[PDB]
Design an enzyme around this catalytic site. Sequence first.
Site, short mmCIF file in Angstrom:
data_model
loop_
_atom_site.label_atom_id
_atom_site.label_comp_id
_atom_site.label_asym_id
_atom_site.label_seq_id
_atom_site.Cartn_x
_atom_site.Cartn_y
_atom_site.Cartn_z
N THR B 1 -35.72 47.45 9.77
CA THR B 1 -35.25 48.83 9.71
C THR B 1 -36.28 49.79 10.30
O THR B 1 -37.45 49.76 9.92
CB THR B 1 -34.91 49.27 8.28
OG1 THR B 1 -34.04 48.30 7.68
CG2 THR B 1 -34.20 50.61 8.29
N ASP B 17 -31.88 52.00 13.71
CA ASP B 17 -31.40 50.79 14.36
C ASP B 17 -30.12 50.33 13.64
O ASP B 17 -29.53 51.07 12.86
CB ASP B 17 -32.48 49.72 14.36
CG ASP B 17 -32.82 49.23 12.97
OD1 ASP B 17 -33.27 50.04 12.14
OD2 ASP B 17 -32.62 48.02 12.71
N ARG B 19 -29.63 46.79 12.14
CA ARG B 19 -29.97 45.42 11.77
C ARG B 19 -30.15 45.33 10.26
O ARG B 19 -31.07 45.93 9.70
CB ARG B 19 -31.28 44.99 12.44
CG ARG B 19 -31.73 43.60 12.03
CD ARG B 19 -32.89 43.10 12.88
NE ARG B 19 -32.53 42.28 14.03
CZ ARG B 19 -33.41 41.75 14.86
NH1 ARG B 19 -34.70 41.99 14.74
NH2 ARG B 19 -32.98 40.99 15.86
N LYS B 33 -26.93 52.75 9.27
CA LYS B 33 -27.99 53.20 8.39
C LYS B 33 -28.07 54.72 8.27
O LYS B 33 -28.89 55.23 7.50
CB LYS B 33 -29.33 52.64 8.86
CG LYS B 33 -29.32 51.14 9.08
CD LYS B 33 -30.68 50.62 9.51
CE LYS B 33 -30.66 49.11 9.65
NZ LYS B 33 -31.98 48.56 10.06
N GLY B 47 -35.12 49.96 3.33
CA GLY B 47 -35.46 49.28 2.09
C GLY B 47 -34.30 48.51 1.51
O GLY B 47 -33.54 47.88 2.25
N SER B 129 -39.62 49.19 8.37
CA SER B 129 -40.49 48.08 8.77
C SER B 129 -41.17 48.37 10.10
O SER B 129 -42.39 48.25 10.23
CB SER B 129 -39.68 46.78 8.84
OG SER B 129 -38.70 46.85 9.86
N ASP B 166 -40.54 44.91 16.63
CA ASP B 166 -40.50 44.57 15.21
C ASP B 166 -39.39 43.56 14.96
O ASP B 166 -38.28 43.71 15.47
CB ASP B 166 -40.29 45.81 14.33
CG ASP B 166 -40.28 45.48 12.85
OD1 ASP B 166 -41.33 45.06 12.33
OD2 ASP B 166 -39.22 45.64 12.21
N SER B 169 -36.19 44.98 12.87
CA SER B 169 -35.35 46.01 13.46
C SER B 169 -34.82 45.52 14.80
O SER B 169 -35.55 44.89 15.57
CB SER B 169 -36.13 47.32 13.66
OG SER B 169 -36.79 47.70 12.46
C1 LIG Z 1 -30.63 48.62 6.08
C2 LIG Z 1 -31.72 48.70 5.00
C3 LIG Z 1 -32.53 47.64 4.91
N1 LIG Z 1 -32.23 46.59 5.89
C4 LIG Z 1 -32.60 45.17 5.65
O1 LIG Z 1 -32.32 44.37 6.48
C5 LIG Z 1 -33.29 44.70 4.37
N2 LIG Z 1 -32.37 43.68 3.85
C6 LIG Z 1 -31.62 43.84 2.57
O2 LIG Z 1 -31.74 44.82 1.91
C7 LIG Z 1 -30.66 42.71 2.15
C8 LIG Z 1 -29.32 43.00 2.83
C9 LIG Z 1 -28.13 42.08 2.53
N3 LIG Z 1 -27.02 41.97 3.49
O3 LIG Z 1 -28.10 41.45 1.52
N4 LIG Z 1 -30.44 42.63 0.71
C10 LIG Z 1 -30.82 41.39 -0.02
O4 LIG Z 1 -31.31 40.49 0.59
C11 LIG Z 1 -30.58 41.24 -1.53
N5 LIG Z 1 -31.21 40.02 -2.03
C12 LIG Z 1 -30.48 38.75 -2.04
O5 LIG Z 1 -29.36 38.70 -1.64
C13 LIG Z 1 -31.17 37.47 -2.58
O6 LIG Z 1 -31.69 37.48 -3.65
C14 LIG Z 1 -31.19 36.19 -1.74
C15 LIG Z 1 -31.75 35.04 -2.57
C16 LIG Z 1 -32.07 36.41 -0.50
C17 LIG Z 1 -31.23 36.74 0.76
C18 LIG Z 1 -31.08 42.41 -2.38
C19 LIG Z 1 -32.62 42.60 -2.34
C20 LIG Z 1 -33.43 42.03 -3.34
C21 LIG Z 1 -34.82 42.19 -3.28
C22 LIG Z 1 -35.39 42.91 -2.23
O7 LIG Z 1 -36.79 43.07 -2.18
C23 LIG Z 1 -34.58 43.44 -1.22
C24 LIG Z 1 -33.20 43.31 -1.29
C25 LIG Z 1 -35.18 44.26 -0.06
C26 LIG Z 1 -35.78 45.49 -0.29
C27 LIG Z 1 -36.34 46.20 0.78
C28 LIG Z 1 -36.31 45.67 2.09
C29 LIG Z 1 -35.72 44.40 2.32
C30 LIG Z 1 -35.18 43.69 1.25
N6 LIG Z 1 -34.72 42.59 1.78
C31 LIG Z 1 -34.75 42.18 3.02
O8 LIG Z 1 -34.34 41.18 3.51
C32 LIG Z 1 -35.49 43.43 3.65
O9 LIG Z 1 -36.61 43.07 4.12
C33 LIG Z 1 -34.66 44.12 4.78
O10 LIG Z 1 -35.43 45.15 5.31
MG LIG Z 2 -34.05 37.65 17.39
#
Ligand SMILES: C/C=C\NC(=O)[C@H]1NC(=O)[C@H](CC(N)=O)NC(=O)[C@@H](NC(=O)C(=O)[C@H](C)CC)Cc2ccc(O)c(c2)-c2cccc3c2NC(=O)[C@@]3(O)[C@@H]1O
Ligand SMILES: [Mg+2]
Lengths: 125, 222, 84, 222, 196, 204, 196, 195, 233, 212
Positions: B1, B17, B19, B33, B47, B129, B166, B169
């Site tokens: 992000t 972005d 993603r 977003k 986040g 990120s 990155d 993103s």
């Molecule tokens: C657009 C805003 C941010 N964009 C991202 O793309 C961010 N992804 C998400 O928030 C995904 C999206 C989705 N479709 O689920 N949510 C989860 O994974 C969910 N966990 C699960 O399902 C699980 O337990 C599975 C076992 C693993 C897949 C909820 C959750 C839990 C703990 C976290 O600390 C985060 C999210 C988290 C917080 C800050 C940044 C990020 C996070 N996680 C990352 O992966 C990232 O790093 C990325 O930045």
């Molecule tokens: Mg790639």
Amino acid sequence: GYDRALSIFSPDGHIFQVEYALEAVKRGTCAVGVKGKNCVVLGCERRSTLKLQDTRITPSKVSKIDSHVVLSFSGLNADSRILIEKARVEAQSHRLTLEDPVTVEYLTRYVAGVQQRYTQSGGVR
Amino acid sequence: TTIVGVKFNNGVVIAADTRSTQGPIVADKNCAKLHRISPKIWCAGAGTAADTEAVTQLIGSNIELHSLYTSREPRVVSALQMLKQHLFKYQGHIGAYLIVAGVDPTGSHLFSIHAHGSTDVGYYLSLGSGSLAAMAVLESHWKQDLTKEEAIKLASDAIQAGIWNDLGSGSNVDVCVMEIGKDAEYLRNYLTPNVREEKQKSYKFPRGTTAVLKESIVNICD
Amino acid sequence: MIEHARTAAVTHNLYYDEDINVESLTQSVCDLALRFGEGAERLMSRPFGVALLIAGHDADDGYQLFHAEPSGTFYRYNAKAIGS
Amino acid sequence: QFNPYGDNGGTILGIAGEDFAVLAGDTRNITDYSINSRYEPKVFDCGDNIVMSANGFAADGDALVKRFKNSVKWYHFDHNDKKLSINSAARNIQHLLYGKRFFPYYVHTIIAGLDEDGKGAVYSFDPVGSYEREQCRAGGAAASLIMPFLDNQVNFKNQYEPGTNGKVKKPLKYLSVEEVIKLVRDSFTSATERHIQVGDGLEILIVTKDGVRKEFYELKRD
Amino acid sequence: TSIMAVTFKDGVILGADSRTTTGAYIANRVTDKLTRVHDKIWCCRSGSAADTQAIADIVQYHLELYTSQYGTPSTETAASVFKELCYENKDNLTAGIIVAGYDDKNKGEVYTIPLGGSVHKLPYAIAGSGSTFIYGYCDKNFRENMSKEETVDFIKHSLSQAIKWDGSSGGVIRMVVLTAAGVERLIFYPDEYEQL
Amino acid sequence: SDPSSINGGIVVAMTGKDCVAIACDLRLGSQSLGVSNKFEKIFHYGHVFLGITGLATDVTTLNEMFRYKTNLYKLKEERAIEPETFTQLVSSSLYERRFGPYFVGPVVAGINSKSGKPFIAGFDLIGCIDEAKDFIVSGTASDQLFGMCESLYEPNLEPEDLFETISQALLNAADRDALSGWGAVVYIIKKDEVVKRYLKMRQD
Amino acid sequence: MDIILGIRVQDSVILASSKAVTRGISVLKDSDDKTRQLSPHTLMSFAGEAGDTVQFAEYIQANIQLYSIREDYELSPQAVSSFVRQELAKSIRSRRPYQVNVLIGGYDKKKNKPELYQIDYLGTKVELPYGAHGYSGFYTFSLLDHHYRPDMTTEEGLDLLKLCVQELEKRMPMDFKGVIVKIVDKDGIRQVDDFQ
Amino acid sequence: MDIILGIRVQDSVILASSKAVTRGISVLKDSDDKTRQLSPHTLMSFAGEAGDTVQFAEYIQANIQLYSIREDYELSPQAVSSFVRQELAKSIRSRRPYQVNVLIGGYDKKKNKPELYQIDYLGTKVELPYGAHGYSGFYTFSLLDHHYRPDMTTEEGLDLLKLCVQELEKRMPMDFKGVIVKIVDKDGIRQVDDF
Amino acid sequence: TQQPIVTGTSVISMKYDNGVIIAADNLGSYGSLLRFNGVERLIPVGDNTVVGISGDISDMQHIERLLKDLVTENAYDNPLADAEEALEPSYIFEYLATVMYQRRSKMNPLWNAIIVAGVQSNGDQFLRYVNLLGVTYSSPTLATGFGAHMANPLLRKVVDRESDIPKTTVQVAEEAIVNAMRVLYYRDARSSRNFSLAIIDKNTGLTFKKNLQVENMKWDFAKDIKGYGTQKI
Amino acid sequence: TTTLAFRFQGGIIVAVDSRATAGNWVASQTVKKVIEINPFLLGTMAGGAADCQFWETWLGSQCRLHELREKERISVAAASKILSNLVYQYKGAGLSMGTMICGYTRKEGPTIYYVDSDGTRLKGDIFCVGSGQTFAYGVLDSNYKWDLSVEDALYLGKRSILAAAHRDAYSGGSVNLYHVTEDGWIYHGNHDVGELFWKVKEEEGSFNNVIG
Ligand SMILES: C/C=C\NC(=O)[C@H]1NC(=O)[C@H](CC(N)=O)NC(=O)[C@@H](NC(=O)C(=O)[C@H](C)CC)Cc2ccc(O)c(c2)-c2cccc3c2NC(=O)[C@@]3(O)[C@@H]1O
Ligand SMILES: [Mg+2]
Ligand SMILES: C/C=C\NC(=O)[C@H]1NC(=O)[C@H](CC(N)=O)NC(=O)[C@@H](NC(=O)C(=O)[C@H](C)CC)Cc2ccc(O)c(c2)-c2cccc3c2NC(=O)[C@@]3(O)[C@@H]1O
Ligand SMILES: C/C=C\NC(=O)[C@H]1NC(=O)[C@H](CC(N)=O)NC(=O)[C@@H](NC(=O)C(=O)[C@H](C)CC)Cc2ccc(O)c(c2)-c2cccc3c2NC(=O)[C@@]3(O)[C@@H]1O
Ligand SMILES: [Mg+2]
Ligand SMILES: [Mg+2]
């Protein structure tokens, strides 16, 4: 520490120390072995027959390496004791690692290898 | 992000972005977003994606109710204060880092909100990120008294640097411009650089390839 | 010597999933011949008092016969007699 | 405490046809959520028509590659320039890997070449040396994404002949070099689309009875 | 963060840097660490940006209500509000505050509230990560009832040294002067306080 | 060990020309031990289908809760709920327990009764709305399903071709995961016809 | 854990439960009935943490008997299984969850069919021809996969259960001191007096 | 742990050892002889960590057999017990100590008396009329404290051992699949065929 | 080294048409204290190699000692040490990389990130990276620490691929390096305004510039920042 | 992983699967879990893939050395005890192995040993090792008898491996069969579980639990 080459080759192709050990063997009491159809006999010579000698405790010329193998020797008695101890230890080790008593051939080959190592090592006769 | 916000002489632009990643795997290749808190107050989130969506929608509902009650245009400072107090109440356990921009009767506004409940103000801001790349671009190309096109180009290039440099993103670039005298403009897929090439084959299986044990017609009506 | 040869052969199998070349086995055996002297890794006192005819077959050089002396040198003979 | 291991992402793929083999790898070297280089190859030609790639920890991969090249050099020195069999190379790599059984090379290893009968072959190694000869194997970040596709399009898994009442499997057949190139390109485009550690570029080494040749293709840089 | 407040003849002057950092990254290099809770009662904040902002907002609300009800508050009253808020929530806060105010009765006053909720009235107060580096300089250079220019120069030198040695402090030097004449905002840029 | 990985299972939804498809595995087990060969994970409310992968008890509780809510919705609105509205309902219900989430990964599929448009979407355990036009995958073999889909899928597939594609994707992804398999079901959905097919797969 | 087995044969449901209760290194009792008759045509065997088992079982029994009295009607086995599953699923997210696994066997009289449900302490319910809780299944399942047959008789089911018990007594590290065998059919619930 | 019991009767020593060895949740064997004949008039039963037990037992057996061959003489049971105790006491402070407990039963021919020694993996040796290793003692001892008698016969000792085995099978959580019973007396070592 | 004490910050470098450029601050940080100013972190080896080191300053001085000793040992019994058998950048790299990987595998690593940049004897631009883990990679643009996050995105806008290297001039690359250093001074807390810059050009040789300062800083808008949100004065 | 070996009138029957996993991920299903130590000795692996493979190949090398040294085949007891002493010398180091050494000698007859990384070495008649050893054990002990024909014993081993592959999630792929007799080991084919399951279901009237 002491690695002086005592058993080396002579200009005529002879390892003198080995031949002198054979001579020491020729100076020891006589021993004989005979094979039957289903038994083996080992005979040995007693140094004359002294009267002040205690025959109940003096070691005999035939020593058991295991329950099924015996060993007679001719030559220096101390080297014989060393070889007998090494052979008994190796017999017990072979029993321990193979779960089977050693063959006469295997024990014989071990003793021969020990002697050969002693004919090619430094600092030893 | 990678989210950025740049103020220009007559308003403010935000960009992000597209993603969403479940860890190291891309989950959505065109995630929106940019969230609408008010018709002229927008917010880019980073986040915990669910946290960002939920907090933006809740504050937008409260903002609409407050604007109906007061019969006045919603103010960016109000959304900022409500988001700040809500996030601080939850001791940062709501993983939402936001860039909130907009135009209200008091003028143009651009703020950033950290999930623990802290807020910063500036002419150019970036979060996420890939925030570092975008911020480097901003610090390299930003100047005072930017035009609309200048700020748009700056924000788009920041988002592009985030996409290219990155791993968190990528995909396409979304933009939202908010000028004082006009309506807000929400450009979805303003840039689509990451388009997939044609696959070397077509894997359309010949029918009958899959073995079936039993069939049944499902009753969906009543 | 025979022990050092046999193990070496099997080891070359274990490390490479293939049979060791006749020349390679002979060379590994000869590597022990001049491992004697004084000083000291301790080495044996005297060189070996036996010569070896090592015969074998591999897919590279076909059938092979080698003469190995305690001099560390080995030759390849179409036919060789050693002894009296 | 000092962590002696790291992950550089990357993905490698190995296929074996009738009279050829192919080992491909992405050229992207990364660390955490940042890119280190867009062209850092990891599929190397070692001689004797044997291509190797140890993907994972870059340091351990480079160390293992250098050790195997040194091993082939000394094998030529000590055995009259005898050609190193592909199975012999696999056994030696197993021993190299198991040498650090208690401090392993954090790498998944894959080599490709021709067997004694001149036919294509691939060998796969876990980080400690459990090796296996196969016809298709993917390793690295996107391995879990590519391996099933191979099983569907190379070994024809779950594919029955149409109309055979799910009783007659699809006839297993050897693929052409063009077909395996198509499959590799599609696998790496998919990996770049869905995995953030894969992209930038794809380098393919093709080992035939005529030698080792290279093909480079661009990949997405998101 | 490097913050300080100094009393002098005509009132009080607060000074701070503009570097808000998350670890080693400069989250904001133009931060306004000088916050106003009442017309002539300001506060220097150090520590958790979120916690300090929450405390400052609540203190400003309390002082606004105090003004609407019982009249203009004293500097000591704002200090007591800060002290209550910090001491009663010591387990969940991490904020060091310097409350500086001006009134006609007590002229300029400075209180400091470190961690734990203690409150101390001082002629000059230093706080923040950088303050540790300028304890000796301030103890050897501070004077009672300085002039406006001498107070500005003292704060400038102290904050410049703190910014130089402390990597957690940087940006620009922000100052707010509270005197009978009112409120004045001053800014000093790196190309000026680095050559000091 | 992990809450989402105690029972295992996979669900995948794809779209085509005037049709959708949703497939799931038929396995329920306590880690290594397989228990049930008949644990379907795709339920339907009116004309909206929902596949739920993850902790089995949470799957069943969410199924019952959504049946409850959809019945009350139909009673109050005098109409069947649409896939987009149901997706929003799922997202809100998931986030309602943000700090004690259901360890599931829901996938909504269907055809909008009015607009006739095909709609699919997926969520995480806290309700993040992930709306894709091509394919949505969830479960333990999420990576295998991702690879298979991103490789095999092409838009505007006919139902007979979309079925083959989704079936091959599901099967080849399940054969690479130990916690999914033991059977599979595929629903092909058009505007006024839903066909359910039990696939044949390896039983290990 | 304890041995909790169930097998559904045509026109009957058979339940087997360990007779041994062991606390520490001492077997306290060798004749423990690990079942509770929820209703004349529905039985439930249970195993798990000491205390929670009998508590949960008697609670479910009380609720089912109260429902039976209130409506003068016996709930179908499906309804009882759903109710206990909901109870367990509410318990898991409580302060102190119930750590009990249950097998529910009942003869649905409105369908005239045997039914067997397996539920763990999590609230995971399944309808299976045969089920087991704990380590028991790890053996018994295999046997059943080879020997089960839908058109079996109650005696054939008893023989299959005896085979399972023999395999368990052969290859299990713990001595569970036999099992109590109960049969649920159209005529209610009966207990095999002599099984081995 | 495993069942390792021993009882010293007038003119005999009886040793009982569980027949079950279980790794994981599966009983791998139900006919395991947990004893090693150190010498014709000295037997040793052992129990403890998997692997270490048989290793230590066969090592002691090899050493005792080597001593017997070297001197053409059988060590007294007291001497064998002292040797095993010294070995264990040297092992405890090593890098990886042996975690094996042993009962040594032997008929001292120079004294014409049965002897029983109990040693744990620490090297604590004791001479007892009856002994046990693991949890077994926690029951058996009581019975013995009530039923033991110095002037008992070998059959009476076998009956007392049967009582101990019955009590264990009644009140033990583990199924040890019966026991192997051996008697060491002036005529050597024999194994009770039906127990 | 098990934990770094006095540390140096980012090191940036990039290729251009006729050579390479490297740069690094003159700061030694005692944790959060900017303790030592005037700390040269660019070590020139020969007339064709420069090593930029970030991390533990003690290990950097150890590597300086090793480089000096390597030059001395290459001078031994080598009549062509001033010519065809002089120290090449690739030699110095491979040596440092072997050392780093060995010390890693012995669980006592050199807490450093090293960038070796120079020109080979045949005019080729060498630019490669190593670290305490022994990981090696080579890209037209290389940075350590914060630079890898902020400097690299800026330096790739000039040279995004190898084919862009012949098109970049020395002035373009040096201006980009100075701009990246300014951005680092903006957004890095452990950075310094004083830095050093080396240029290894296959025609002009080694150009080493010390005591440089970041100039042309934009700070005026800081006067317009008042309050953290709703505050108006 | 699931391996079984049992003795009967016709010698020894050995049957393994072919699935190797790295957690939930099925790493491979083409793994040969029977190591041909020599034409008269077989080694079945379970646990550490590299551990078992490497050390059983090393055991084969040691057996070749013993045969060359003593001009006699190595006994099953000695072959098993070599690997046992090796793994005990590596005890506590992190080795995870459970193997079965099966052979036919003139001294011992047909002999089966179980050897694990804990140092345990047990001579036995029926052994099942691996994650799915319980299902194997079950089917075997239910249908075992010393008077089995070679055909029936091979079928029983295959069926036990099949049941263990069905129930256990970490065992599967394909069944590898072996018959050890006086003349050595005889390979009885690699049977894919995917087709073997349906074959057994249709021919036995069993596996009625499956929806197929
Ligand atoms: C657009 C805003 C941010 N964009 C991202 O793309 C961010 N992804 C998400 O928030 C995904 C999206 C989705 N479709 O689920 N949510 C989860 O994974 C969910 N966990 C699960 O399902 C699980 O337990 C599975 C076992 C693993 C897949 C909820 C959750 C839990 C703990 C976290 O600390 C985060 C999210 C988290 C917080 C800050 C940044 C990020 C996070 N996680 C990352 O992966 C990232 O790093 C990325 O930045
Ligand atoms: Mg790639
Ligand atoms: C007040 C004027 C300048 N203040 C600063 O300049 C301070 N920076 C911040 O508070 C950043 C700013 C931002 N927008 O991110 N916020 C956080 O850290 C938030 N926690 C997070 O992020 C986290 O998860 C981790 C906990 C931190 C990496 C809120 C928070 C929580 C607990 C704390 O004990 C502190 C801050 C804290 C207290 C004393 C000094 C500092 C703190 N934290 C530091 O980072 C700093 O060192 C710096 O002094
Ligand atoms: C013997 C017949 C089938 N063998 C199996 O079926 C076993 N599978 C494997 O060993 C896989 C296979 C593959 N990837 O090809 N290899 C690894 O794991 C390898 N790397 C890794 O552990 C890593 O990454 C480390 C982080 C870095 C090296 C080696 C390894 C290391 C330590 C172990 O304690 C085991 C394996 C282990 C032992 C007992 C049982 C199992 C094991 N590991 C398991 O995964 C399993 O559970 C399964 O039984
Ligand atoms: Mg599976
Ligand atoms: Mg399985």
